[PDB]
XYZ file of C-alpha atoms in Angstrom:
397
model
C 0.489 40.866 -13.121
C 2.663 41.069 -9.743
C 5.945 42.048 -8.877
C 8.323 41.603 -5.762
C 8.166 45.331 -4.978
C 4.284 44.884 -4.398
C 5.156 43.077 -1.217
C 5.939 45.472 1.691
C 8.343 44.442 4.660
C 5.281 44.556 6.860
C 3.619 41.694 4.851
C 6.972 39.671 4.805
C 6.948 39.936 8.559
C 3.414 39.068 8.863
C 3.673 35.994 6.463
C 6.840 34.663 8.184
C 5.074 34.978 11.548
C 2.267 32.502 10.827
C 3.894 29.233 12.175
C 1.362 26.477 11.377
C 1.819 22.800 10.354
C 0.612 20.533 7.236
C 1.000 17.035 6.239
C 3.196 15.595 3.271
C 1.752 13.466 0.382
C 4.376 10.784 -0.765
C 3.957 9.548 -4.339
C 5.517 6.665 -5.902
C 5.548 4.633 -9.123
C 3.342 1.616 -8.570
C 4.712 -0.320 -11.641
C 8.343 -1.621 -11.616
C 9.684 -0.013 -14.806
C 9.559 3.204 -16.773
C 6.931 1.398 -19.243
C 4.230 2.196 -16.463
C 3.709 5.808 -15.527
C 0.773 5.169 -12.914
C 1.354 6.540 -9.372
C -0.376 6.492 -6.001
C 0.392 8.016 -2.723
C 0.190 7.622 1.204
C 0.620 10.385 3.794
C 4.303 10.538 5.307
C 4.556 8.886 8.644
C 6.886 9.232 11.789
C 8.868 6.135 12.587
C 6.082 4.976 14.836
C 3.452 5.115 11.998
C 1.616 8.108 13.158
C 1.165 10.970 10.511
C 4.209 12.919 10.001
C 4.032 16.861 9.915
C 6.089 19.866 9.178
C 5.961 23.126 10.823
C 6.234 26.381 8.740
C 4.061 29.067 6.945
C 2.121 29.413 3.659
C 2.397 31.916 0.850
C 1.123 32.593 -2.593
C -0.523 35.573 -4.725
C -3.584 33.705 -6.010
C -0.758 28.580 -5.979
C 0.349 28.112 -2.425
C 3.852 27.208 -1.424
C 5.037 25.986 2.272
C 8.189 27.282 3.833
C 9.688 25.011 6.524
C 13.088 24.541 8.431
C 12.652 20.787 8.107
C 15.449 19.732 5.723
C 14.572 18.146 2.155
C 16.537 14.893 2.982
C 14.467 14.425 6.176
C 11.255 14.707 4.227
C 12.480 12.201 1.521
C 13.562 9.800 4.237
C 10.236 9.897 5.999
C 8.546 9.266 2.428
C 11.023 6.253 1.711
C 10.472 4.669 5.164
C 6.541 5.043 4.876
C 6.161 3.570 1.451
C 8.948 1.017 1.756
C 8.976 0.310 -2.009
C 11.116 -2.565 -2.992
C 11.374 -1.965 -6.903
C 13.924 0.027 -8.803
C 11.672 2.876 -10.350
C 10.038 4.157 -7.277
C 10.671 7.751 -8.366
C 9.424 9.221 -5.139
C 8.335 12.813 -4.967
C 6.752 14.585 -2.018
C 4.425 17.683 -1.563
C 2.567 19.707 1.144
C -1.209 19.094 1.674
C -3.699 19.567 4.586
C -6.055 16.925 3.354
C -7.171 14.463 0.481
C -8.906 17.361 -1.436
C -5.841 19.795 -1.453
C -3.555 19.491 -4.701
C 0.276 19.280 -4.871
C 2.005 22.099 -3.194
C 5.685 22.638 -3.133
C 7.548 22.439 0.124
C 10.457 25.031 0.236
C 13.313 24.520 2.951
C 14.197 27.958 4.283
C 18.102 28.742 4.261
C 20.103 29.005 7.439
C 21.718 32.282 8.911
C 25.116 30.959 8.553
C 25.510 30.700 4.850
C 28.656 30.809 2.661
C 28.813 30.755 -1.327
C 27.970 27.104 -1.866
C 24.996 26.117 -4.227
C 21.946 25.269 -1.861
C 19.077 24.793 -4.389
C 17.949 24.526 -8.070
C 15.467 26.797 -9.781
C 13.875 25.787 -12.935
C 12.480 28.010 -15.746
C 11.009 26.462 -18.803
C 8.256 24.673 -20.756
C 7.095 20.928 -21.054
C 10.828 19.898 -21.342
C 11.222 20.880 -17.693
C 7.493 21.060 -16.075
C 7.248 18.680 -13.102
C 3.708 19.488 -12.143
C 2.507 23.095 -12.703
C 0.111 22.736 -15.673
C -0.989 19.387 -13.840
C -2.100 21.074 -10.680
C -3.700 23.744 -12.696
C -5.625 21.090 -14.603
C -6.801 19.492 -11.278
C -4.688 16.288 -12.241
C -6.334 15.621 -15.546
C -3.609 17.061 -17.923
C -1.453 15.009 -18.824
C -3.338 11.976 -17.999
C -1.740 10.325 -14.812
C -2.066 6.886 -16.000
C 0.205 7.526 -19.089
C 2.329 10.644 -18.099
C 4.242 10.183 -14.829
C 2.425 12.482 -12.307
C 2.559 16.009 -14.101
C 5.694 15.276 -16.155
C 5.496 15.245 -19.906
C 7.309 11.915 -19.786
C 7.224 8.589 -18.297
C 9.587 9.610 -15.337
C 11.842 12.300 -14.075
C 12.894 15.305 -16.485
C 16.673 16.198 -16.822
C 16.495 18.922 -13.985
C 15.464 16.212 -11.539
C 18.283 13.813 -12.382
C 20.812 16.967 -11.965
C 19.316 17.796 -8.630
C 19.575 14.035 -7.480
C 23.235 13.769 -8.547
C 24.050 16.946 -6.594
C 21.697 16.158 -3.550
C 20.081 19.399 -3.952
C 16.194 20.337 -3.844
C 14.662 21.341 -7.166
C 11.981 24.168 -7.356
C 10.119 24.234 -10.526
C 8.603 27.292 -12.199
C 8.453 25.627 -15.797
C 5.044 25.569 -17.293
C 4.127 22.842 -19.920
C 2.971 24.540 -23.067
C 2.083 21.452 -24.952
C -0.999 21.320 -27.350
C -3.973 21.835 -25.120
C -2.261 23.445 -22.089
C -3.764 26.973 -22.963
C -7.088 25.689 -21.712
C -5.816 25.715 -17.819
C -3.636 28.993 -17.728
C -3.103 31.674 -20.366
C 0.152 31.474 -22.230
C 2.588 33.693 -20.394
C 6.315 34.316 -21.055
C 9.393 32.797 -19.263
C 10.044 36.347 -17.965
C 6.479 35.945 -16.150
C 8.077 32.786 -14.589
C 11.068 34.858 -13.296
C 8.518 37.404 -11.824
C 6.382 34.793 -10.290
C 9.667 33.205 -8.796
C 10.859 36.544 -7.243
C 7.570 36.950 -5.449
C 8.004 33.639 -3.774
C 11.671 34.227 -3.059
C 10.744 37.400 -1.149
C 8.810 35.398 1.454
C 11.723 33.063 1.809
C 14.048 33.367 4.873
C 17.878 34.082 4.522
C 17.731 33.883 0.676
C 20.878 34.688 -1.258
C 20.105 34.457 -4.995
C 24.010 34.059 -5.572
C 23.765 30.538 -4.073
C 20.848 29.240 -6.464
C 21.568 27.273 -9.696
C 19.200 28.593 -12.251
C 18.225 26.398 -15.276
C 16.454 28.030 -18.210
C 15.102 26.502 -21.382
C 12.312 27.977 -23.366
C 10.891 28.298 -27.035
C 10.114 24.642 -27.747
C 6.425 24.988 -27.235
C 6.456 28.728 -28.459
C 7.836 27.591 -31.987
C 6.131 24.141 -32.210
C 2.409 25.032 -31.188
C 2.116 28.808 -30.514
C 3.738 29.731 -33.783
C 5.640 32.625 -32.252
C 8.157 34.873 -34.113
C 12.016 34.615 -33.199
C 12.265 38.222 -32.632
C 9.495 38.029 -29.947
C 10.779 34.801 -28.182
C 14.251 36.500 -28.362
C 12.822 39.570 -26.377
C 11.177 37.377 -23.843
C 14.473 35.364 -23.274
C 16.606 38.448 -22.948
C 13.934 40.103 -20.683
C 13.929 37.129 -18.361
C 17.954 37.103 -18.350
C 17.988 40.943 -17.524
C 15.296 40.333 -14.740
C 17.166 37.268 -13.198
C 20.586 38.875 -13.228
C 19.283 42.223 -11.992
C 17.759 40.253 -8.967
C 21.217 38.935 -8.296
C 21.489 35.625 -10.104
C 25.083 34.367 -10.673
C 24.733 30.849 -11.551
C 22.814 30.021 -14.753
C 22.550 26.854 -16.884
C 21.204 27.446 -20.522
C 20.336 25.014 -23.251
C 19.931 25.064 -27.092
C 16.524 23.638 -28.264
C 16.338 20.379 -29.935
C 15.205 20.075 -33.483
C 11.203 19.725 -32.777
C 10.592 18.693 -36.334
C 12.272 15.233 -35.598
C 9.380 14.474 -33.147
C 6.809 11.658 -34.360
C 4.006 14.343 -34.690
C 5.708 15.886 -37.654
C 4.782 12.640 -39.624
C 1.468 14.208 -39.927
C 2.744 17.835 -40.821
C 3.691 19.480 -44.199
C 7.393 19.601 -45.504
C 6.834 23.384 -45.567
C 5.823 23.446 -41.823
C 9.021 21.186 -41.145
C 11.431 23.783 -42.673
C 9.366 26.740 -41.138
C 9.676 25.304 -37.558
C 13.373 24.134 -38.064
C 14.427 27.661 -39.340
C 12.854 29.268 -36.166
C 15.011 26.939 -33.932
C 18.275 27.293 -35.712
C 18.004 31.054 -35.635
C 16.765 31.035 -31.933
C 19.769 28.597 -30.950
C 22.133 31.332 -32.309
C 20.432 33.849 -29.890
C 20.793 31.294 -26.856
C 24.550 30.968 -27.633
C 25.161 34.920 -28.027
C 23.252 35.552 -24.625
C 25.573 33.057 -22.872
C 28.815 34.617 -24.288
C 27.593 37.994 -23.214
C 26.851 37.046 -19.705
C 30.356 35.159 -19.607
C 32.181 38.548 -20.709
C 29.978 40.445 -17.791
C 31.400 38.012 -15.193
C 28.581 35.560 -14.604
C 28.896 31.747 -14.008
C 27.217 30.519 -17.095
C 26.966 27.064 -18.590
C 25.741 26.231 -22.125
C 24.611 22.779 -23.355
C 24.242 21.880 -26.935
C 20.937 19.735 -26.662
C 20.430 20.399 -30.185
C 23.602 18.655 -31.199
C 22.778 15.709 -28.872
C 19.293 15.452 -30.283
C 20.720 15.252 -33.760
C 23.072 12.483 -32.811
C 20.182 10.589 -31.099
C 17.819 10.921 -34.169
C 20.572 10.286 -36.603
C 22.023 7.255 -35.020
C 19.939 6.055 -31.926
C 21.923 2.612 -31.455
C 25.313 4.582 -30.911
C 23.684 6.076 -27.875
C 22.150 3.063 -26.358
C 18.595 3.531 -28.017
C 16.811 1.448 -30.500
C 14.010 3.835 -31.984
C 14.336 7.402 -32.657
C 11.416 8.009 -35.161
C 8.238 6.510 -33.337
C 6.285 7.252 -30.279
C 6.721 4.524 -27.647
C 2.884 4.978 -26.889
C 0.485 3.801 -29.410
C -0.646 7.380 -30.593
C -0.934 7.545 -34.365
C -1.881 11.394 -34.689
C -0.922 14.866 -33.153
C -3.836 15.990 -31.116
C -4.213 18.044 -27.914
C -7.221 15.641 -26.703
C -4.818 12.712 -26.503
C -3.140 14.147 -23.153
C -6.578 13.708 -21.618
C -6.499 9.881 -22.060
C -4.706 6.900 -21.142
C -2.704 5.022 -23.850
C -1.150 1.662 -24.157
C 2.580 1.123 -25.403
C 2.943 -0.298 -28.963
C 4.019 -4.133 -29.277
C 7.384 -2.953 -30.559
C 7.974 -0.498 -27.519
C 6.861 -3.260 -24.965
C 9.365 -5.678 -26.725
C 12.271 -3.142 -26.391
C 11.080 -1.265 -23.366
C 10.597 2.628 -23.172
C 14.158 3.053 -21.984
C 15.259 2.078 -25.606
C 12.904 4.576 -27.125
C 14.008 8.450 -27.597
C 10.254 9.695 -27.719
C 7.438 8.825 -25.271
C 4.484 10.394 -26.855
C 4.335 12.209 -30.357
C 6.526 15.300 -28.962
C 8.309 14.390 -25.690
C 11.413 12.531 -25.081
C 11.475 9.556 -22.385
C 12.760 9.576 -19.029
C 16.001 7.695 -20.390
C 16.665 10.515 -22.930
C 16.285 13.069 -19.921
C 18.696 10.980 -17.750
C 21.089 10.882 -20.821
C 21.134 14.807 -20.993
C 21.735 15.253 -17.312
C 24.616 12.593 -17.496
C 26.176 14.645 -20.435
C 25.644 18.036 -18.454
C 27.252 16.494 -15.280
C 30.306 14.880 -17.066
C 33.870 16.016 -16.115
C 34.971 19.218 -18.026
C 31.404 19.787 -19.476
C 30.790 22.925 -17.536
C 29.394 22.353 -13.887
C 32.771 22.466 -12.286
C 32.506 26.279 -12.562
C 29.638 26.108 -9.766
C 30.271 26.055 -6.016
C 28.650 22.618 -5.042
C 28.687 20.914 -1.419
C 30.538 17.618 -1.139
C 28.767 14.528 0.386
C 30.460 11.771 1.982
């Protein structure tokens, strides 16, 4: 496909010189709880009510990104003042757009010249456990259905990387691509190493970029073993290639996680016991490769953190009450089958899930965890002595 070395320094100068402007689309949850995924938007405004604009330049290889010097905190504030949402689950997100026909484009705040060693952004690689909108924009906002899945997330709200970024007051730049059944119809199945290569081309257009100051998150293989029936040896090769690529490019801070036992998801109520054991054995074997890769990069001198998401998902499915949940075996939504077509449609919650609330359910659909589970994983990764102390964070009064 495309590599950072294809981009010349003449092209970097030429792209950075094109100082233009764009508008910001402020999205918000219209409902007042995580049970309701529906979103709406308004354009960001200045304090006087006139349309807000950001100066900067655009760059892409095909999937445009806007680079600005306007701080991420300023943009969020402008969206919060414009919408004036008075409910608790506003879950506001913001994107660059010239007009109503444009899709959601990431805004990247360029780094300053005066830079030390503090973490100044989060960069996510992964699948439908991390995706915040990449398959959604490729599907022209049809997949997953925005009435039932929260604006491009394969959940009813924020994913675990977004809650980590909120807690650390950092921006999150997502490269994760949802590989859920039916995703292959919008973009062809590419490796996590292709997400690293795509990232690297965008970071080459960024100003004053120091990859040692990025917190990278990497989770892959769930969709590869669940529906793309990949072999452990091939996912191992794609995973290790990606880590060689990231660390050769100067990454120093990486967060890794084991895969949860996918076979516990409600979709496996419609599977054979043979398919259960086959999928489980792949995960168990691949988790041991994730653990070895982490220990290898710790000995090489990198700042690695590893989180046992698998151990947590066992505890959650074994005894959901012990962790603040009520149900760990059923889909909150009234979906009684495993079909790719179901992501194209809106669905009601079951009577049982409307009674307990989606915050008490482990699973949102037949595959994916609820936003409450994502928030729980983030809380555990954030806990004192759970590993994040090894990263250089800024303090905020």
